[PDB]
């Protein structure tokens, strides 16, 4: 598809690279650093490369109006959820240290100006912008000014809307990814629209492309690798019996390992060209292709015809099935036995 | 992608239809009708819709030269394998009756003129042509003359080669499918080249597109659904401990059920357009989009600026984050409290 690439720390990302799975722990820790550490342990032990957090500073993120609005996958106000779930600066700094102490890359999604400045103080190697802030052009400008790569979710937004965000990003001169995304928790298969990935890469030829996913399993993400996706994001939990509005669409260690294995196969299998000559197929061609044979006894001097000629495996005859019709009307130079391959010396 | 369709018996096939999995029992029965019936039972009980056989009449299929050539996935001559494995006319007619007695569609691949005439006598509803006969234009002409749809594998052949086959097919006026395929047993992931499917549909806009597969698992086939594949073919066996050169790349009842479930999800998830407005996302937009707020106390009469304005969730303010800059320079009509959403009545 393309050769766009950039680095998140030491990890190269892009079409010619192994797909990257982002383990979005998000608010799954329910505000408990202990729980967050257990989930980081589970992610490390499953082989995860990247852990993503969400950086919530409720006062800079929401006006009082947020205390009256309820999200789709919850039964209380968004302000209550974020107040209950948010880690303070001290705890989030400990979370970054812990993730990196396990050899993994820590990134996070800022939901406010204050969160973005905190992540800059911590010097994270790349920024995620959630689909809710895809059209928050003031916030994107700030984050782009940090000089780090940006991974931008694009749910709830048109290509025309996304263009303004990409413009801001290009102007700051940082590389970026676009994650196709549908922000319904959970997302029904029929609303995934994997074709949206092609729409994004077609509109934005310099973007790394991936999928942020909220379905109940790995199928959408595996199809996105098949379509050329380079970054896959699903929520992550150490076990499925945890409480939380995002747990149910999360992967756990087992299903993370499956996605990793599926994505590696699909990275290998994807792309390429129909007409590529595959050396491993040569033995098969040699026995499976047909050659021209006599369909009857043909006397010396008789004319070769569609009536005394046919074609049979294997493919080592002097004349291939491709040349069948070119023998019509040639003259038998010898007697020719029924069933014999037609030889170059069988015709004048 | 497209709206091409045709019918195999009562089963509609094509991009707007459920993907069809062809259970290729092939020569997996090792010449035993009993074994073939056990494998048909296993396919029925797993929910299979179509069972494919291979119709081998060794004398019409191979000249004596085939007694000296060995295939890649075997250790004796192709002639010996086919002689040992082939069902005679009486047994194959029983196989078709049995498949249809379980409510399934029976099709088969002819490897010779004689095999094609036998399948015509049995009146099968569609013909498969294997990748070895993709360039057997005499055989394709015969099969196309039968008036039934054709499902053509395209391994070992260029687009330019396939064009001659499609020309013959179009001339007889039967609908057809093209299965991308790599004829290595088993096929390494890296040789699948799923992009070959796009090459085929681009060159042949009227074709139904699918994949014939010989890898060790379902990943290639699942990626082919994601890419728009309508027909998926893998070898099938009732259990993996059977003998046979094709067993090891076969599905069994369990892995057939997985492919069926994956393909149904990917059929739902695939295609579509980025800019489609998704009703289920509306609640999320309402709380996640930002509105313009006062970043400071602003006295009556003061000018609105980038310095006393910012943006915060949720999205029910009078001014969206989109209109942030249009408020610059407006005049405060009332005193405005820090943190308050900017109201239409807050500006002259």
Automatic annotation (TrEMBL), chains A, B:
GO molecular function, one term: metal ion binding
BP-aspect Gene Ontology terms: carbohydrate biosynthetic process
Metal-binding among keywords: yes
PROSITE patterns named in the record: AFP_LIKE (PS50844)
Annotated residues for binding of (R)-malate 2: 52, 109, 128, 185, 214, 235
Domain of life of the organism encoding this protein: Bacteria
Annotated Mg(2+) binding sites: 214, 235
Keyword Transferase attributed: yes
Amino acids binding (R)-malate 1: 52, 109, 128, 185
Gene3D superfamilies per the UniProt record, alphabetical: Aldolase class I, Antifreeze-like/N-acetylneuraminic acid synthase C-terminal domain
CDD domains in the record: SAF_NeuB_like (cd11615)
Binding, Mn(2+): 24, 214, 233
AFP-like domain sequence ranges: 291-348
Key words of the record: Metal-binding, Transferase
Enzyme Commission numbers on file: 2.5.1.56
PANTHER family the UniProt entry points to: N-ACETYLNEURAMINATE SYNTHASE, SIALIC ACID SYNTHASE
UniProt name for this protein: N-acetylneuraminate synthase
Organism: Neisseria meningitidis serogroup B
Lineage: Bacteria, Pseudomonadati, Pseudomonadota, Betaproteobacteria, Neisseriales
Gene (name only): synC
């Amino acid at each position: 598809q393309n050769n766009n690439e950039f680095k998140i720390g030491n990890r190269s990302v892009g079409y010619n690279h192994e797909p990257l799975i982002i383990c979005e722990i998000g608010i799954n820790h329910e505000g408990s650093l202990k729980t967050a550490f257990e989930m980081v342990d589970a992610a490390y032990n499953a082989g995860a490369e990247v852990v993503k957090h969400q950086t919530h500073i409720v006062e800079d993120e929401m006006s009082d109006e947020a205390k009256q609005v309820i999200p789709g996958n919850a039964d209380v106000s968004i302000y209550e959820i974020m107040e209950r779930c948010a880690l303070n600066e001290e705890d989030e700094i400990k979370l970054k240290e812990y993730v990196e102490s396990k050899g993994m890359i820590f990134i996070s999604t800022p939901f406010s100006r204050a969160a973005a400045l905190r992540l800059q103080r911590m010097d994270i190697p790349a920024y995620k912008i959630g689909s809710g802030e895809c059209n928050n052009y003031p916030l994107i400008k700030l984050v782009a000014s940090f000089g780090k790569p940006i991974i931008l979710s694009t749910g709830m937004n048109s290509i025309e809307s996304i263009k303004k965000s990409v413009e801001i990003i290009r102007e700051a001169g940082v590389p970026y990814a676009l994650l196709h995304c549908t922000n319904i928790y959970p997302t029904p298969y029929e609303d995934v629209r994997l074709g949206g990935m092609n729409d994004l890469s077609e509109a934005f030829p310099d973007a790394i492309i991936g999928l942020s996913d909220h379905t109940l399993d790995n199928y959408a993400c595996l199809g996105a690798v098949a379509l050329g996706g380079s970054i896959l994001e699903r929520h992550f939990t150490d076990r499925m019996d945890r409480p939380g509005p995002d747990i149910v669409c999360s992967m756990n260690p087992d299903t993370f390992k499956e996605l990793k294995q599926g994505a590696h196969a699909l990275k290998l299998a994807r792309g390429g060209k129909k007409d590529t000559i595959i050396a491993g197929e040569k033995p098969t061609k040699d026995f499976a292709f047909a050659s021209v044979v006599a369909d009857k006894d043909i006397k010396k001097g008789e004319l070769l015809s569609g009536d005394n000629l046919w074609v049979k495996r294997p493919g080592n005859g002097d004349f291939s099935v491709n040349e069948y019709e070119t023998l019509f009307g040639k003259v038998a130079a010898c007697n020719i036995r029924k069933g014999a391959q037609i030889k170059k010396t069988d015709i004048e």
